[PDB]
Symmetry: D2
Subunit: 210 residues, 4 copies
C-alpha cells in the first residue's frame, strides 16, 4: 500500500518534449522494496490547473512520499530543490499564455517551505549509481517551483508534514537539445535513459529511507 507519487510536466515553451513526463510515464507502477509502488501523473504547465490536479492526487493517492519532477533546460546534471518559494514570477508565459510578476502564491502563508526529501541520501545513491548531481537552492519561480511550494503547503496544512516531498529538476534530453535554434547556445543534455534512471534511483532512495 505505500505509494510514492511521481509527477512530471507536459512540454512547454519551444520544447517539443519533456523528459520529466517521459520519466514519470516509464516508471509508473514500478514496485520498490518494502511494498512501495510508484504512482505517476502528468501535470500541465499552468499553475492553477497544476495545483488543482496535484491537490486531487495528494488527497486521492494519499502518498507516503512525493517526488515532483520537471525540466530545467540548461542544467547539466539532475538536481534536488532545497526550497520552494511562495512567489510566482514568470520569465516566459505558461501554457495558457499567462505571466505573473512578484505574485504571492498564498496570502498569509509561509514565504517558503524547505523540501522534506532525504536530500543527502539521494545524492549518495546517485553517486553510487555513477550519476552526477547536486542540490539546487532555487527552483525558479515558474510552475515547477509553484507545485513544490503547493505540495509542501498542502501536506503541512493536512497534518502530513512528515511525508517526504521535494522536487527533482532534470536536464534536457536529446529531443529538447536537438530542437534548440542554431543561433542559440547548445544545451547540456542527457539521454532519456539516463534521466529516467536518475529519477528511479532517487525514488528508490526515498522509499528506502522512509
Amino acid at each position: 500500500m505505500p505509494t510514492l507519487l511521481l509527477t512530471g510536466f507536459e512540454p512547454f515553451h519551444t520544447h517539443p518534449d519533456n523528459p520529466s513526463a517521459q520519466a514519470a510515464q516509464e516508471l509508473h507502477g514500478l514496485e520498490l522494496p518494502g511494498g512501495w509502488g510508484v504512482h505517476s501523473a502528468l501535470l500541465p504547465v499552468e499553475p492553477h490547473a497544476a495545483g488543482a490536479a496535484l491537490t486531487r492526487l495528494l488527497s486521492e493517492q494519499d502518498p507516503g512520499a512525493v517526488l515532483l519532477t520537471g525540466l530545467a533546460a540548461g542544467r547539466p546534471q539532475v538536481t534536488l530543490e532545497r526550497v520552494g518559494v511562495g512567489v510566482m514570477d514568470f520569465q516566459i508565459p505558461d501554457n495558457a499564455g499567462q505571466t505573473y510578476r512578484d505574485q504571492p502564491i498564498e496570502p498569509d502563508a509561509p514565504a517558503a517551505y524547505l523540501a522534506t526529501l532525504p536530500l543527502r541520501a539521494i545524492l549518495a545513491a546517485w553517486r553510487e549509481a555513477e550519476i552526477p548531481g547536486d542540490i539546487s537552492n532555487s527552483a525558479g519561480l515558474y510552475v515547477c517551483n509553484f507545485v513544490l511550494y503547493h505540495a509542501l503547503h498542502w501536506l503541512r496544512e493536512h497534518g502530513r508534514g512528515a511525508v517526504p516531498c521535494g522536487f527533482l529538476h532534470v536536464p534536457a534530453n536529446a529531443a529538447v537539445a536537438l530542437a534548440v535554434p542554431a543561433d542559440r547556445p547548445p544545451l547540456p543534455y542527457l539521454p532519456q535513459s539516463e534521466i529516467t534512471r536518475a529519477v528511479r534511483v532517487a525514488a528508490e532512495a526515498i522509499t528506502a529511507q522512509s
Copy 2:
C-alpha cells in the same frame, strides 16, 4: 536623521579584494535627497561575528532602510536577492575556516524571509542610469545569504518589519578578475566605479521610495 545602513564584506577565499567593501567605504556619509544619510560598515566573512556585528548596527543605528551588499564572483550584472533562506550550507570555508552542512540558522523561525526593498523601483532606477541588473532568487547559502536572513529576522522580531531591507550582490571588480588563476575560466567583471555607482543608484531609489 533617517539612516540607510549600507554594509559590505571583507575579502574572502582567494579574492584579494571585495568590491562590496570598496563600495560601502566610498559611499559612507553620502547625503541622499530626503534628509537621508548613508552609514557604512564592513562585516567579516564569518556568520557568527557577522551576525553579532549586524545586530549591533541594526540596534545602534536604527536605520530607516538596510542595504546589505556582497560579492558574487561569476555573476555578470548587479542583482537584488529576493529571498534569504534560513540555512547555512558552505561550498567553501568561511574566513575562520569553518563549513556548515544543511544547518538551520534559527530553530523555530521561518524557513525564509522575502527581501522588503522596493525591488522593481531599484531595477527601474538602474535601467534609467544605463545599468544592467536583475532580481536573483537565490543568494546562495554562504555568509551573504546568512546576513540577509539575519537582518530580516531581527527586524521582524523587533517590530521593524516595515524597514525595507535586502541584499545587493555585485560582480567581481578588476582586482578580483585579475587574481583568477590562468587555468580557470575568466570572470565577468565591472570596474569598481561601475559597481559603486550601482550601489549608489540603489540606495537613492530605496530612500526615494522611503
Copy 3:
C-alpha cells in the same frame, strides 16, 4: 607619419550599439608616443563591402600597424585573436541578410593567418593597467574573422607581412547588455569607458613595440 589603423564595426543583429565603433570613434587622431597617430574607420558588418573598404584603408593609409576591433557579445573580457581562418560560416545573417556556409574566403590561399600583433606585450600592458584579458584562438567565422583574414592576407600579398596586424574583440557595453530580451541569459558587459581604455592601452603597446 607612422599611422596605426584602428577599425570598428557598425551595429548588427539585435544590437542597438557597437562598442567597437564607439571606441574607434573616440580614439581617432590620438597621438601616441614615437610620432604615431591613430586613424580610425568604421566597417560595415558585411564581408564584401568590409573587405573593399579595408583594402582601400590599407592601401591609402599605409599603416605601420593595424588594430581591427569588434564586438563579441557574451565574452567577459577583451581578447586578442590569435588566428584568422580562411572560411566564412555565418550563424546569423550579416547586415545584408546574407549567410555563408563553409565558404572559402579565397581559392588557393592559406587556410589561416596567425595575427602578427605583439600578443604578450598587449596582455602585459593590459594587466599593468588593471584590465583583465586573454588571447582567443577562434574569432568565429563571421565578419570579424573575415576582416582579420582579409587584412593579414592583403598585407602578406603586398610584401607588408611585417606590419603588425590583429583583432581585438570587446565585450558588450551597457547599451548592448540592456537590449537583451528578458527571457535570455544576461550578458557580461563593460562600461564603454573601460572598453575604449582597453583598446587605447592595446594601441599604445602595439606602437611602443613597433
Copy 4:
C-alpha cells in the same frame, strides 16, 4: 581492407578517465559497411610521443580515413574540429609536466590545416541518430589540436591529402564529471554509451562517404 584509424587519448590532468579512450577501445575492430574496419589506438597526452605514435600508425596502417578523438571537458555535445592550428600553447601541463607558450609546431609549414572529414555528412548522421552536435572552430592549442595538425600535415606531405582526417571532441563522461571537486562548477556530461555511439555514427558516416 580499407581501414579507418580511430584514436583516443589516455587520462590526463585531474581526470580519472578519458571517454575518448573508452570509445576507441570499444570500437576497435568494428566492421563497417563498405568493407571498412576500424583500427583503434590510444595516444599519450604528450605531443612528442603522441606525434611519434601517430606517424607510425599513419605509416603502418595506411588508413582510408582518420578519426582522432579526445576529451573536451566542459563541452555539452560532441563536436567536430574544423581546423588544426600549428601552435602549441598549453594552459595546463601535459602528462610529462611540460608546457609550451606560443610554440610553432613546424617551421616553414602552414599556419593551419582544415579538417578533411565530411563535416556536414557527420552532423546530419548524428542528427538522424538523435545526437546533438556541432562543428567547433577551435580545438584548443593543447595535445588534441597538436595531433590534428600533425596528422593533416603528415598526410599532405606524403601525398595523402585526399584521406579524410579530422578531430572529434567528446564531452566528459560520468566518471569525469563525478571527479570534479565540490567547489568547482558542475560539468556537462554524457553516459559513455552515448559518447561511444556518437563516435560510431561518425565513423560510419565517414566511410559511407568514403
